[PDB]
Amino acid sequence: DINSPEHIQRRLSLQLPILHHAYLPSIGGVDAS
């Protein structure tokens, strides 16, 4: 199936460098609430 463990967990979403995000930091570690 298209939805399967190895298939589902492959699709990791990350923030593409669109506009300001291209030059502003996005990854520093885990977020705090």
Binding site: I2, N3, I8, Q9, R10, R11, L12, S13, L16, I18
Partner: protein, 97 residues
Amino acid sequence: MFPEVVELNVGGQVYFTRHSTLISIPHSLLWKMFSPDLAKDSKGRFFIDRDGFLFRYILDYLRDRQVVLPDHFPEKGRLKREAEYFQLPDLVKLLTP
């Protein structure tokens, strides 16, 4: 069958949009997907394996039935390819010289 606000993942970029926006153009690819078995990502958002940067414009065309390109956009041919994949005939002609 679908919520009012749909969670989309296009090439790794998360997008939120109304269900009405996806079906705004009948007989289109996005219309065929969400018209009353789909692919979903790790977090449960519907997944589209296409260019994440170019999907912004494609999604805006569904909103307004028109699209303003960025200033000095020389990748129009590339945006045309995405328009063909999503099956938006009128947008393809707007991008075709």
